[PDB]
Design an enzyme around this catalytic site. Structure first.
Site, PDB file in Angstrom:
ATOM      1  N   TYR A   1      75.171  85.389 -90.797  1.00 26.91           N
ATOM      2  CA  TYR A   1      74.461  84.235 -91.299  1.00 26.91           C
ATOM      3  C   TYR A   1      73.847  83.522 -90.092  1.00 26.91           C
ATOM      4  CZ  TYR A   1      78.101  85.457 -94.664  1.00 26.91           C
ATOM      5  OH  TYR A   1      78.931  86.151 -95.532  1.00 26.91           O
ATOM      6  N   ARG A   2      72.575  83.319 -90.181  1.00 31.64           N
ATOM      7  CA  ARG A   2      71.827  82.626 -89.189  1.00 31.64           C
ATOM      8  C   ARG A   2      72.331  81.207 -88.951  1.00 31.64           C
ATOM      9  NH1 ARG A   2      65.850  82.037 -91.981  1.00 31.64           N
ATOM     10  NH2 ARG A   2      66.041  79.803 -92.518  1.00 31.64           N
TER      11      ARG A   2
ATOM     12  N   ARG B   1      73.997  78.962 -92.276  1.00 32.21           N
ATOM     13  CA  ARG B   1      73.089  79.310 -93.387  1.00 32.21           C
ATOM     14  C   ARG B   1      73.480  80.579 -94.142  1.00 32.21           C
ATOM     15  NH1 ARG B   1      68.519  82.774 -94.411  1.00 32.21           N
ATOM     16  NH2 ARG B   1      67.015  81.710 -95.789  1.00 32.21           N
ATOM     17  N   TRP B   2      74.590  80.500 -94.866  1.00 30.33           N
ATOM     18  CA  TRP B   2      74.921  81.534 -95.817  1.00 30.33           C
ATOM     19  C   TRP B   2      74.227  81.232 -97.173  1.00 30.33           C
ATOM     20  CZ3 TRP B   2      80.526  80.437 -94.172  1.00 30.33           C
ATOM     21  CH2 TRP B   2      80.919  79.142 -94.564  1.00 30.33           C
ATOM     22  N   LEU B   3      73.535  82.224 -97.717  1.00 29.03           N
ATOM     23  CA  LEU B   3      72.997  82.084 -99.063  1.00 29.03           C
ATOM     24  C   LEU B   3      74.192  82.147-100.044  1.00 29.03           C
ATOM     25  CD1 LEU B   3      69.864  84.329 -98.533  1.00 29.03           C
ATOM     26  CD2 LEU B   3      70.033  81.830 -98.264  1.00 29.03           C
TER      27      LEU B   3
ATOM     28  N   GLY C   1      79.890  86.276 -99.150  1.00 31.22           N
ATOM     29  CA  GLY C   1      81.330  86.148 -99.059  1.00 31.22           C
ATOM     30  C   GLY C   1      81.708  84.817 -98.444  1.00 31.22           C
TER      31      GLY C   1
ATOM     32  N   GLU D   1      85.271  93.892 -94.615  1.00 28.33           N
ATOM     33  CA  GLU D   1      84.294  94.664 -93.891  1.00 28.33           C
ATOM     34  C   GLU D   1      84.995  95.360 -92.657  1.00 28.33           C
ATOM     35  OE1 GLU D   1      82.738  91.544 -95.975  1.00 28.33           O
ATOM     36  OE2 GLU D   1      81.054  92.457 -96.627  1.00 28.33           O
TER      37      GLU D   1
ATOM     38  N   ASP E   1      61.125  84.123 -91.090  1.00 32.58           N
ATOM     39  CA  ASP E   1      62.082  85.105 -91.707  1.00 32.58           C
ATOM     40  C   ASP E   1      61.492  86.536 -91.770  1.00 32.58           C
ATOM     41  OD1 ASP E   1      60.524  85.130 -94.028  1.00 32.58           O
ATOM     42  OD2 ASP E   1      61.981  83.960 -95.192  1.00 32.58           O
TER      43      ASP E   1
HETATM   44  C1  LIG Z   1      71.635  91.894 -90.093  1.00 32.11           C
HETATM   45  C2  LIG Z   1      71.208  90.481 -90.431  1.00 32.11           C
HETATM   46  C3  LIG Z   1      71.515  90.059 -91.695  1.00 32.11           C
HETATM   47  C4  LIG Z   1      71.219  88.773 -92.111  1.00 32.11           C
HETATM   48  C5  LIG Z   1      70.535  87.923 -91.275  1.00 32.11           C
HETATM   49  C6  LIG Z   1      70.188  88.314 -89.975  1.00 32.11           C
HETATM   50  C7  LIG Z   1      70.549  89.620 -89.556  1.00 32.11           C
HETATM   51  C8  LIG Z   1      70.282  90.164 -88.174  1.00 32.11           C
HETATM   52  C9  LIG Z   1      69.452  87.233 -89.139  1.00 32.11           C
HETATM   53  C10 LIG Z   1      70.455  86.224 -88.592  1.00 32.11           C
HETATM   54  C11 LIG Z   1      68.584  87.798 -88.014  1.00 32.11           C
HETATM   55  C12 LIG Z   1      68.401  86.505 -90.001  1.00 32.11           C
HETATM   56  C13 LIG Z   1      68.778  86.155 -91.459  1.00 32.11           C
HETATM   57  S1  LIG Z   1      67.601  86.683 -92.587  1.00 32.11           S
HETATM   58  O1  LIG Z   1      67.570  88.185 -92.656  1.00 32.11           O
HETATM   59  O2  LIG Z   1      68.044  86.076 -93.888  1.00 32.11           O
HETATM   60  O3  LIG Z   1      66.166  86.293 -92.311  1.00 32.11           O
HETATM   61  N1  LIG Z   1      70.214  86.594 -91.685  1.00 32.11           N
HETATM   62  C14 LIG Z   1      70.915  86.133 -92.854  1.00 32.11           C
HETATM   63  C15 LIG Z   1      71.574  87.020 -93.700  1.00 32.11           C
HETATM   64  N2  LIG Z   1      72.208  86.606 -94.830  1.00 32.11           N
HETATM   65  C16 LIG Z   1      72.268  85.263 -95.112  1.00 32.11           C
HETATM   66  O4  LIG Z   1      72.941  84.791 -96.219  1.00 32.11           O
HETATM   67  N3  LIG Z   1      71.687  84.370 -94.284  1.00 32.11           N
HETATM   68  C17 LIG Z   1      71.022  84.770 -93.172  1.00 32.11           C
HETATM   69  O5  LIG Z   1      70.483  83.879 -92.469  1.00 32.11           O
HETATM   70  N4  LIG Z   1      71.479  88.384 -93.442  1.00 32.11           N
HETATM   71  C18 LIG Z   1      72.155  89.293 -94.417  1.00 32.11           C
HETATM   72  C19 LIG Z   1      73.680  89.354 -94.524  1.00 32.11           C
HETATM   73  O6  LIG Z   1      74.391  89.320 -93.287  1.00 32.11           O
HETATM   74  C20 LIG Z   1      74.048  90.685 -95.191  1.00 32.11           C
HETATM   75  O7  LIG Z   1      73.424  90.664 -96.470  1.00 32.11           O
HETATM   76  C21 LIG Z   1      75.562  90.953 -95.277  1.00 32.11           C
HETATM   77  O8  LIG Z   1      75.814  92.264 -95.805  1.00 32.11           O
HETATM   78  C22 LIG Z   1      76.262  89.871 -96.067  1.00 32.11           C
HETATM   79  O9  LIG Z   1      77.649  90.166 -96.146  1.00 32.11           O
HETATM   80  P1  LIG Z   1      78.477  89.510 -97.395  1.00 32.11           P
HETATM   81  O10 LIG Z   1      78.361  88.004 -97.313  1.00 32.11           O
HETATM   82  O11 LIG Z   1      77.863  90.115 -98.665  1.00 32.11           O
HETATM   83  O12 LIG Z   1      79.852  89.997 -97.132  1.00 32.11           O
HETATM   84 MN   LIG Z   2      81.681  90.885 -97.664  1.00 34.59          MN
HETATM   85 NA    NA Z   3      79.439  91.642 -95.303  1.00 33.00          NA
END
Ligand SMILES: Cc1cc2c3c(c1C)C(C)(C)C[C@@H](S(=O)(=O)O)N3c1c([nH]c(=O)[nH]c1=O)N2C[C@H](O)[C@H](O)[C@H](O)COP(=O)(O)O
Ligand SMILES: [Mn+2]
Ligand code: NA
Ligand SMILES: Cc1cc2c3c(c1C)C(C)(C)C[C@@H](S(=O)(=O)O)N3c1c([nH]c(=O)[nH]c1=O)N2C[C@H](O)[C@H](O)[C@H](O)COP(=O)(O)O
Ligand SMILES: [Mn+2]
Ligand code: NA
Lengths: 465, 469
Positions: free
Chosen positions: B156-157, B169-171, B175, B218, B267
């Site tokens: 989460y960013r 910033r968790w959507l 989790g 995880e 984004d």
């Molecule tokens: C690999 C990655 C992923 C993610 C992100 C980023 C990266 C590098 C960053 C921090 C660069 C940018 C954003 S973005 O892709 O949404 O633009 N980021 C991000 C975000 N998921 C989220 O809820 N907020 C976030 O801020 N995601 C997705 C999230 O981590 C992913 O969906 C996980 O599998 C979530 O795990 P769970 O919560 O389902 O266990």
């Molecule tokens: Mn998970």
């Molecule tokens: Na995860």
């Protein structure tokens, strides 16, 4: 005054020409080698040892944009825009300079001694019908004007002294023959074909100048000086004086032959079809003549690289008419003419549709373009990463896709439902303005130009590659 | 047991990691360099001399499919297919494979807490010119909920808003977010402990972003990728475990009701998203290695590193599509289509109209692809991953009006502003397959095939020809 040999020397000096001494068959093998070479951006190729022949075979001459630019006496590819600005004015056009004798008539054979089998004509693909001449500058006059047209029409070998002349019906040569037939029933149509002329003449031949104008005149502008020519031995046509080989002859009226199949620039075989037979009465060549050839196939190939360089020529002509157009690109992957990407500075709602219609109507070379993608100027039209991004973030497919049915299509395009007729699709992938959408449109990420410039400055020093 | 440094050494040996000694600003400059590098398929990058900091900055780690694969101990990407098969069966008792907890770990070599915590000492990157503030982008956030023991990891960013404050910033379907939400209901007004690990081993990182069910840690998935249990350590100020080899760990909590305006930030769609409120993460401890390295990335106009990651992880669903549609040879979502908005599918066509069934399959079979707006279907002589083949197919095998399918009023991502109404829009499929009798009355083109004997002969003399050298 630079002939072709002078150009080959210039290329060799710059590591842009490789001499191959191994034995290589003009039947299939040369094409395979040239294809791998072109696909890796390699040099032009001079096969000094073609199996079964004494005359070296030159190909991949224009396999890179650079070498196309070099071939018009320019440093690089963005000088072609200036040649576009010139090609605009032609919508006292300098004649040819006729020499008294010429290197291309050093060795002459005529009548029964004519034997095209002595020449290392290439067979390009396994199911091609016969060896095929691919870089001949065909020279013709019509009965009504004096203008000498030059075109590249593929020519199948069908005998010691007979070639099939495959000009499609809108070509200068084909129109000249057609008019000759009406105006002089049953009279032979003189024709001549030059192989290995100077690069300016070759490029001039392929550039779509208007039917009214001799391609020789355009070559003169590219060169800076009048095109040096010589009168043919058996007719009143002039061919380039520096040509390596010249074929002279005629077309007997009504004589036709089944042509092909042959692999095409689309990556498929064309089916058999009938074209006129060119009877060769003379073959004239230089001492130590070099045979210039190429191939077409799945792109990219040399013709397609030629066609990307010649698009740069059109950009200015399009921009004269549509100054909103920032860039205009026909990907080689789209068979060179079937797909265009256009980027604009959009000035009003619905602008993209005017631009699509302009591409489909303004110049004839784009009349058969089936797909046109229109984008804003923050997109690089030459990078699928930007274009797909624009498509997938700025379009609702049903709202922003224009379809037009029953429009002109190339009769060889087998994908249209009927020969000569099919549809066109434009994708409006521009940012949508109020009126075009009621949503809040996204604010795109723009880079800082100062950071871009700074990183340009240290790029080489960073040394990542 | 390979930590991150061991991975960087492996990459360097294989010409997949470049050390940059020139001074480079984490404010904007690193992103520019990484972007060019990723777009040219170049190496990962270690910036040893970030302007204004002493801690090197690592990015573009996973900028190439190869490096994703290498990150799971493999040559290529297709071990992810096996994970797909696994995750399928559940809707294998020793997939309850736990963490191995060390007492003491390199990530706790140096410790700072309370008022000494200063996130400004870390070379946090600012990615784009109108981004609101520096942003932490490769943090593994670790959380527990009140009802189960499972530890979730998510990326989460995290926006910088103070010496010791980040926005989390968790959507809302994540989790972490669900854990916090449940914690709030179950313990009104109590602080929610949370920890964030930067620069863990690649299997843990990749495991964090694998879409495993909420029911599973995880950490267990990273174990399967690695071949061994994930090495962790208890945090100093809470009962969460973080990876032992992590370069930096942030520990702290969320004060209930404390929120801050987050963004705007560029984004993965290439646009800025607008300001919105998210919880504030208060950092009470920062623990790090000697000679710590800071792992970062950026998201933006694709392709970017997350999108390359996302492509490799889509391999997890291909086998589930192929069980259902065995005609499907490949199924590819280009990064440059924002990772999910465009699909290229190649099939062995078996009957007239086949392409339409496949399009409808993509748009209906799994929820992962229901919002895919464009679908291009081609024959198996096309490499779905090469626009040279796909454009060739589109421009030689389609009549646009005949072969384009449009469906109106279908579900679309609410955030996609290009649809006419939020949540509702159209979709397009392009049938670029060879057309069979019935679909066309024309004589269809025979494609040009090379003579294999000539190809082999030229392979044999290629080096001797010496065209290059
Ligand atoms: C690999 C990655 C992923 C993610 C992100 C980023 C990266 C590098 C960053 C921090 C660069 C940018 C954003 S973005 O892709 O949404 O633009 N980021 C991000 C975000 N998921 C989220 O809820 N907020 C976030 O801020 N995601 C997705 C999230 O981590 C992913 O969906 C996980 O599998 C979530 O795990 P769970 O919560 O389902 O266990
Ligand atoms: Mn998970
Ligand atoms: Na995860
Ligand atoms: C550069 C080049 C061009 C051309 C061609 C070839 C090359 C190498 C070869 C022989 C290799 C391939 C075919 S093909 O691309 O149609 O498969 N060929 C060709 C053909 N134009 C044409 O009518 N028949 C042809 O046979 N074209 C195009 C044509 O020569 C060009 O459009 C001229 O500008 C037409 O000139 P005008 O008749 O307009 O004066
Ligand atoms: Mn002409
Ligand atoms: Na011409």
């Amino acid at each position: 005054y630079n002939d072709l040999r002078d150009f080959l020397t210039l290329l060799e000096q710059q590591g842009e020409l490789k001499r191959i001494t191994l034995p290589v068959d003009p039947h299939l093998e040369i094409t395979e080698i040239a294809d791998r070479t072109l696909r890796a951006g390699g040099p032009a190729l001079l096969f000094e040892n073609p199996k079964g022949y004494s005359m070296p075979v030159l190909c991949n001459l224009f396999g890179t944009p650079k070498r196309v630019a070099m071939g018009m006496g320019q440093e690089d590819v963005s000088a072609l825009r200036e040649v576009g600005k010139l090609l605009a004015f032609l919508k006292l056009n300098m004649p040819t300079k006729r020499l008294r004798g010429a290197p291309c008539q050093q060795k002459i054979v005529s009548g029964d001694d004519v034997d095209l089998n002595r020449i290392p004509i290439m067979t390009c693909w396994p199911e091609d019908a016969a060896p095929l001449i691919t870089w001949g500058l065909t020279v013709t006059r019509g009965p009504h004007k004096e203008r000498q047209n030059l075109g590249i029409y593929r020519q199948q070998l069908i005998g010691k002294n007979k070639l099939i002349m495959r000009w499609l019906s809108h070509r200068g040569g084909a129109l000249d023959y057609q008019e000759w037939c009406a105006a002089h029933p049953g009279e032979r149509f003189p024709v001549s074909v030059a192989l290995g002329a100077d690069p300016a003449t070759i490029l001039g031949a392929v550039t779509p100048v208007p039917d009214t104008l001799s391609e020789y005149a355009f070559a003169g502008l590219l060169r800076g000086t009048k095109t040096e020519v010589v009168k043919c031995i058996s007719n009143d046509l002039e061919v380039p004086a520096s040509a390596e080989i010249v074929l002279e002859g005629y077309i007997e009226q009504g004589e036709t032959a089944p042509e092909g199949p042959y692999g095409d620039h689309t990556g498929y075989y064309n089916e058999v079809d009938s074209f006129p037979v060119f009877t060769v009465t003379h073959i004239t060549q230089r001492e130590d003549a070099i045979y210039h050839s190429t191939y077409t196939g799945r792109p990219p190939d040399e013709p397609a690289v030629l066609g990307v360089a010649l698009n740069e020529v059109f950009v200015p002509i399009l921009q004269k008419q549509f100054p909103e157009i920032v860039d205009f690109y026909l990907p080689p992957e789209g068979c060179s003419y079937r797909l265009a990407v256009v980027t604009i500075k959009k000035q009003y709602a619905g602008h993209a549709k005017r631009v699509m219609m302009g591409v489909w109507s303004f110049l004839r070379q784009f009349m058969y373009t089936k797909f046109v993608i229109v984008c804003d100027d923050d997109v690089n039209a030459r990078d699928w990463n930007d274009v797909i991004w624009a498509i997938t973030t700025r379009m609702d497919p049903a709202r922003d896709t224009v379809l037009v049915e029953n429009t002109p299509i190339d009769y060889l395009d087998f994908a249209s439902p009927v020969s000569g007729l099919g549809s066109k699709m434009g994708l409006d992938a521009t940012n949508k303005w109020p009126g075009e959408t009621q949503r809040e449109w996204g604010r795109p990420i723009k880079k800082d130009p100062d950071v871009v410039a700074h990183i340009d400055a240290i790029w080489d020093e960073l040394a990542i590659f």
